[PDB]
Amino acid sequence: VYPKALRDEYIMSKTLGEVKLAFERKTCKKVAIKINVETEIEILKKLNHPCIIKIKNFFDAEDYYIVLELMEGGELFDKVVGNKRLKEATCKLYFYQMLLAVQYLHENGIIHRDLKPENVLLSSQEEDCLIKITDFGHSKILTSLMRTLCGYLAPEVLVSVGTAGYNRAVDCWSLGVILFICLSGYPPFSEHRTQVSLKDQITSGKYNFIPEVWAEVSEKALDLVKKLLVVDPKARFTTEEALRHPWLQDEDMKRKFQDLLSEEN
Amino acid sequence: VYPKALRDEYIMSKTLGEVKLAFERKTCKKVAIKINVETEIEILKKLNHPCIIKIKNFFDAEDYYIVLELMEGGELFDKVVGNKRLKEATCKLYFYQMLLAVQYLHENGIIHRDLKPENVLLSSQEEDCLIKITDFGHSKILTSLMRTLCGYLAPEVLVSVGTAGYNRAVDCWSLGVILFICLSGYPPFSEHRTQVSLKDQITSGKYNFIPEVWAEVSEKALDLVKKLLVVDPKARFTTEEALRHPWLQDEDMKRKFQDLLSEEN
Numbered sequence: 176v177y178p179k180a181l182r183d184e185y186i187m188s189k190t191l192g193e194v195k196l197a198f199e200r201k202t203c204k205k206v207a208i209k210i211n212v213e214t215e216i217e218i219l220k221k222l223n224h225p226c227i228i229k230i231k232n233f234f235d236a237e238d239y240y241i242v243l244e245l246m247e248g249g250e251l252f253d254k255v256v257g258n259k260r261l262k263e264a265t266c267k268l269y270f271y272q273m274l275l276a277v278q279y280l281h282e283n284g285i286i287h288r289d290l291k292p293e294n295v296l297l298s299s300q301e302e303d304c305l306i307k308i309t310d311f312g313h314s315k316i317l318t319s320l321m322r323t324l325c326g327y328l329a330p331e332v333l334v335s336v337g338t339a340g341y342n343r344a345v346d347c348w349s350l351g352v353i354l355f356i357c358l359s360g361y362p363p364f365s366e367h368r369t370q371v372s373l374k375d376q377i378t379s380g381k382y383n384f385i386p387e388v389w390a391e392v393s394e395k396a397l398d399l400v401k402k403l404l405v406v407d408p409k410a411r412f413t414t415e416e417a418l419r420h421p422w423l424q425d426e427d428m429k430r431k432f433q434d435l436l437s438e439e440n
Numbered sequence: 441v442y443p444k445a446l447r448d449e450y451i452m453s454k455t456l457g458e459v460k461l462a463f464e465r466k467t468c469k470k471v472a473i474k475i476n477v478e479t480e481i482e483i484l485k486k487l488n489h490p491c492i493i494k495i496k497n498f499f500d501a502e503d504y505y506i507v508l509e510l511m512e513g514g515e516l517f518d519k520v521v522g523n524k525r526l527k528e529a530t531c532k533l534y535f536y537q538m539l540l541a542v543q544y545l546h547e548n549g550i551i552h553r554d555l556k557p558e559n560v561l562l563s564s565q566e567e568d569c570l571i572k573i574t575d576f577g578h579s580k581i582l583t584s585l586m587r588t589l590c591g592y593l594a595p596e597v598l599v600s601v602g603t604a605g606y607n608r609a610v611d612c613w614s615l616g617v618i619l620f621i622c623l624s625g626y627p628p629f630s631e632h633r634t635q636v637s638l639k640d641q642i643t644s645g646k647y648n649f650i651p652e653v654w655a656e657v658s659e660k661a662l663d664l665v666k667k668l669l670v671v672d673p674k675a676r677f678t679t680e681e682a683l684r685h686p687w688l689q690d691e692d693m694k695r696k697f698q699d700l701l702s703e704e705n
């Protein structure tokens with residue numbers, strides 16, 4: 176069941192919510208088409224950054240279709256499941272780019288709110304490539320406490336003034352996890368074995384640690400992840416602050432990357 | 441500058457944001473027309489309760505016009521400024537109705553978020569009448585923590601689970617103030633004389649008390665207001681709970697009211 180307007184310009188096919196693959200009926204080049212719903216469309220349209228999915232065209236009605244230049248690399252997930260881990264360089268380079276996107280989002284008062292390896296797509300199958308992020312279905316645009324101010328009011332709201340603004344830290348948190356994962360290979364906060372509620376586990380920040388593997392990582396890498404998973408959003412590394420962190424001061428990361436951009440032209 | 445479609449069916453005139461008065465160009469009967477903007481229109485359309493403004497017709501474009509059956513009584517504010525206070529009966533009857541509206545709103549997962557004497561309109565000039573509430577421009581429709589559950593996540597969000605739901609208590613709080621006012625004649629939390637930040641004043645709940653006037657109120661009335669201005673939204677009287685409170689168990693209040701409805705037919 177395909178709308179007439181759609182099948183006219185493309186050849187919708189397999190499956191990669193879940194998104195489907197199609198061929199540009201004019202160039203024979205392949206692309207992927209996506210399948211509070213206006214939000215993502217409105218945002219994905221505002222999205223204009225290398226490490227972020229870029230839209231090529233849009234078509235609504237029936238069901239929702241957003242075609243974007245396809246990422247061959249697939250999901251970052253696929254590359255780091257079955258506890259397969261990844262090389263420091265891979266991580267640094269990968270994560271580095273994530274940091275750029277997450278930063279560019281926050282800079283535009285945008286929150287992803289759902290950052291995970293799945294939503295981190297790669298350029299080409301190779302272990303070295305560029306990475307973008309998709310699925311902006313949960314995002315939010317942040318502009319309200321101004322109404323509360325200059326005026327009465329209820330207590331809980333007033334106190335809320337001391338928290339407003341740090342609604343973006345959640346992305347840093349998830350980025351920390353995503354990083355932790357790539358570097359280690361295992362979930363920081365896993366309901367595996369251990370015990371104790373996940374809420375009590377994640378809220379405490381006492382991530383499950385296993386040196387038997389964390390002994391191979393860098394001396395600066397772990398210290399970063401550690402400073403990234405802070406239970407206090409106020410003391411949690413800002414997307415900006417992270418980029419300045421030592422483990423991200425790597426000419427290699429910015430040399431195998433600053434050129435991989437020209438590999439697009 | 442009036443749109444052609446508008447002046448066709450009504451005679452827009454004086455001023456009562458601020459709302460203007462107009463005459464039904466078919467019946468010679470008077471009505472008031474109102475002047476995140478779709479929200480109020482969408483909600484005011486869902487509004488179907490005695491103690492709540494009822495819409496008669498809607499017209500958009502240019503500037504925003506929502507015509508509702510006019511309240512002659514005007515603002516509850518007007519009746520209780522200059523520290524003029526009000527009789528216990530007036531309050532009980534008045535506030536009682538407020539409690540009904542605020543309840544009916546919450547029952548429909550609706551929050552007013554801006555309850556003050558101004559936004560409490562009256563039926564007729566008399567000291568005894570029905571009262572509705574308007575200005576739903578700040579309201580909200582409450583459905584999100586379900587997304588957080590059944591799934592990772594950041595700490596602050598998880599803890600947020602222990603607060604979600606009580607976003608409506610703010611209306612009870614303001615109702616308590618509105619009540620306090622009517623009963624006493626003076627603001628519970630006033631930056632007048634005293635000192636100490638309003639945030640530190642309202643957040644503490646230590647309302648400015650003056651017995652030199654609070655000695656005339658009922659023995660149950662004050663106890664209600666007191667139990668209504670609680671710094672903890674979890675222990676703050678629910679709109680439902682309030683109606684059960686002793687000071688609202690008054691056959692008179694429900695006799696001068698249950699009949700004032702038939703005074704509309």
Ligand SMILES: Oc1ccccc1-c1nc(N[C@H]2CCNC2)c2ccccc2n1
Pocket residue numbers: 191192193194207228243244245246247248249250293294295296309310
């Ligand atoms: O190639 C693209 C070009 C632009 C935008 C997206 C993609 C994309 N997207 C996927 N899917 C989702 C499912 C939920 N989170 C990840 C995906 C999943 C598997 C393999 C390739 C994929 N390629």
Ligand SMILES: Oc1ccccc1-c1nc(N[C@H]2CCNC2)c2ccccc2n1
Pocket residue numbers: 456457458459472493508509510511512513514515558559560561574575
């Ligand atoms: O008569 C009505 C019928 C339906 C809906 C509203 C009204 C209404 N509304 C007012 N105004 C606002 C300004 C901000 N909060 C209160 C108002 C203000 C003064 C006098 C009469 C008024 N009558």
